[PDB]
Amino acid sequence: WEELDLPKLPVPPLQQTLATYLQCMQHLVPEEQFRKSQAIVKRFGAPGGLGETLQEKLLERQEKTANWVSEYWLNDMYLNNRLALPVNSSPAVIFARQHFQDTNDQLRFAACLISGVLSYKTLLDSHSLPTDWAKGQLSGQPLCMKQYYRLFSSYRLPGHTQDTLVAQKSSIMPEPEHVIVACCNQFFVLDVVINFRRLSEGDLFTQLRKIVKMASNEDERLPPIGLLTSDGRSEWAKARTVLLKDSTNRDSLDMIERCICLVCLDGPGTGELSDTHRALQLLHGGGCSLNGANRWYDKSLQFVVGRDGTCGVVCEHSPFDGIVLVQCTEHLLKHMMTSNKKLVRADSVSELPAPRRLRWKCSPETQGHLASSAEKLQRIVKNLDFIVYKFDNYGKTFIKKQKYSPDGFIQVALQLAYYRLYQRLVPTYESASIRRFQEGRVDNIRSATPEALAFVQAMTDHKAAMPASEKLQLLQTAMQAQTEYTVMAITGMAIDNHLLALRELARDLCKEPPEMFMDETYLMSNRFVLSTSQVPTTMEMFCCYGPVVPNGYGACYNPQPEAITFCISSFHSCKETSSVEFAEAVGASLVDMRDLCSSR
Template sequence: MLARVIRSMAKPARMQSSSLVKPVSLTKIPGRYLAHQEGLPKLPVPPLQQTLDRYMAVLQPIISQEELEHTKHLLDEFGKPGGVGERLQKGLERRARKTENWLSDWWLQTAYLEYRMPVVIHSSPGVVLPKLEFHDRQGQIRYAAKLIAGVLDFKTMIDNETLPVEYLGGKPLCMNQYYQILSSCRIPGPKRDTVINYTLSKSPPTHVTIVHNFQFFVLDVYNSDGSPLTVDQICTQLEKIWNSSLQTNKEPIGILTSQHRNTWGNAYNNLIKDKTNKESVKAIQKSIFTVCLDAPMPRVSDELYLSRVATQMLHGGGSRWNSGNRWFDKTLQFIIGEDGSCGVIYEHAPAEGPPIVALVDHVVEFMRSAETVRSPMIPLPMPKKLRFNITPEIKKDIEKAKQNLNIMVHDLDVKVTVFSHFGKNFPKSQRMSPDAFIQVALQLAYYRNYNRCCSTYESASLRMYRLGRTDTIRSASIDSQHFVQAMDDPSKSNQQKVDLLQKAIVAHRAYTNMAINGQAIDRHLLGLKMQAIEDLTSIPEIFMDTSFAVAMHFNLSTSQVPAKTDCVMCFGPVVPDGYGVCYNPMDEHINFAISAFNSCAETNAAHLSHLLEEALLDMRDVIIQLPKSKL
């Protein structure tokens, strides 16, 4: 079940005051990245009994007393001296001594590469950027050219190893993910995928992929002397691409990448049997990143606009619209619509949200500050159009992919809202963590809707450790349960409610600190289970228990992804009857994206969004109604 939890976007560390990242040196510093990485501590293996005790604590608000007693018996048996747990723990500790990171390979395989649902909706997050002011081809091309130049500016720092190191609480963070997001791609397999990165190859790529009207082009973005093309030069090349892709009777080959991974793995092998197809696919996979120049979508009201753009970022709107204008396996795809909609979708296996958000912040700031440079009129070669030979079998695969994707598109319910009543400054003014405040509000909204607490996932960064990815902050606690039960109880005074709210927030902060210091329970439990599999022993009973199934069934899968840009990340639910909730707390407002599946009668994204707004306002009101001396 842990493999289902793939919405793991960790919280970015605080960046410098300007969104435009400045290199630490104007010249290349060879070996700086490796020297930094080697100086980071290894991810610890938490004490066994500590994890078992904390596991019992997180079960309390989400399972019955009878189930709790049964699970306690299993845990006592598992954790007894000389028992199964102790043997697996020692195996994990041996693995930790021998490897750079005892978790990273297991996590990559179980959460991503062995996960067989489509990456679309089920895995890849999208980012919705503020609406742009252009409504035509010229504006779209000009913006795309500036964006490409901004990404190349960021890439220079990665190539030169001059990217500033990020810190959290005064401790340096692992920067490895920044070196995985460019020139990389996921490759489908019949049972397990792989990720390939061309950054360190003998001839690193010098091109990006441009997609327009379902047609793919190779755009070389460096001159012969190694300097990047200017914005003017890129504009000229994008114009050529646009003009040569006007016919729309091309098969949307990219839609194949939206399939169930086993299905796509088989179709992929069929596709690359042809030499031309194989070379075209390789060019896409090897490119630095992809830019999708989308056709305009049907107009909607201002209220629905952000939600519509979120679906464009996540899936492209279906086979009738822009879903064929993607290569969903590509790590990084920037999407620019002719109607001014703009954002990003990224394949999740190589990285979490922070490098993506830092890159987006940098690019947005770069485009604001970039001066127009008039380029000498040196003729540039025509960008290469990638050819595909479509056999009847490939055509059949494309039609099947269209049908399956359209079913997924119609099933996804997304609601993006801007909560405008207050932002992170309000909880800060009450000496409360904004993230914890929002998480407790989510617990209250869910409880009001379902009259129960649920297993809740919030990602926490493990980047204080070498090759660290994420662990889980479990937001449903016994303290949050006491608060949500008291909030609508007329017999409770405002003072009692605020006291319980403060306890819930303190508990959330404590779990967060525990998680970022490598002491949370979820990845440790995964490690113990994987160690049992590797030892070829039977799976311990604690992992076959009903309580474990409930604990791993995350009805709320959430992530705070703060950015300086006024944007919001979005992703699909991780269970059929659940919600995906992502938020970006700005100073005076909060951007929320909530997703659910229409096929589940019990979930509704717009309704949860409304309940969340009410919960935030009610929590604020109960605080401000107290005399200041009582807080």
């Protein structure tokens, strides 16, 4: 089970990648600028030029590695990003609002959840989790499962210029496995194993009760160290290095760096507990004066079990993508109601030892860093413009009856929504899984196609100028284009990863940065004003995340049979963006598109 037999990620032909690149950008940049890029690309791709030299090096790389883009992609997409993890990088999954009449109901839920995680982790450790299969026209095929084995064994260490993804060095003989429980910004070690025994749901309940009792005590409250994990990666690397000066912090950091996951017992919030309100809390906790410090962003999974019923999971994106995260969470949720009745179962034981509180040595430097982080987090809280928009007019069954793909249909709509608001399309990003190949993560589908441009123009720039007969046909060619790019991407023939490798190979072999990658056209192509992804679920929950550029949007959608849930974000600091206006534009676009299909 090392996936050595899975197909290796393909390396696309050079001329095809360059040709698709120019075609994708033409309608997105000024005529004058485009003409220069054509010359730049021609020089780059000429016989015996830089491009062919690099391509030859890339093929060499493909033979020597399991996946030629892994290292490059992991650094470019996550580890090199200097922005704070909250909102900018770490996505959150929000569960249904829970009903807790008192603390004990909240703790039983948490206890049941932890128990489910130990069971799920048991299936993994013994390789009993069934292999995911991809449905195909003539057959199916196994998908890479590497992401699952990083769910509970990963930690993201901050670095001054580049972060590090650490794979828990489980080379240490059997020892006390544990989870970290965050309460009132205090962190506690909760051992899940004592002797050859695994704690029962009842025991966990008993242990959590002691934690809530000790954390509630104001007499011995420690500083909210978790706040430091919410800052810029370079700031946190500096603050963390200051912490390492004392043996006490060194021990506490180690415990956190070797836990299975975090369980955050958040305090009650104010206001109506609407989908939007609950999302805001999972995304950033509401700042350090609410739940923003009751966190530790370097850890992959942080389960949140709030007193008022707000529950969910915030996760660090570098080790795995949303599809795998959702499969894990669904398996966990379903088993919390199993089945148972018876008786118881549981166991418881004794008498078990009390859960231990992690200590910290706080100096004047650290105190300075805490105040900086606090202000920094508030800016993020105030800057996030977010909304959970539920489109209930229709969903998958309607789109399917029109013989169109629900994903492509929704992507075309998003292009229409953007056009009717800005009268132009922009470089768009849509996550596409390449798990068919060894260590496969994702590549990009560029939905802002020439065909989509033609469709949106006829839909809003006509004003009764043309028949529904034509509009209906332009939509067809646009849908065909989406489907085509989608198949190109999931089969490893897209352009993003290919260009990324050529660029990095050039950085490592060329004394001076190539004209090809300094070209404004190229830089613009990688500024995704519209960042999107589909995260479908079979139950009451949804995933959400922030924009990847200051003047951008983040759009995550969940397609249901009779409805579609849209999670939209943007920054208040950018006057030209508004999450509510864009959501309503998406709605309008879906209604306009249905009326068009009805006119057939």
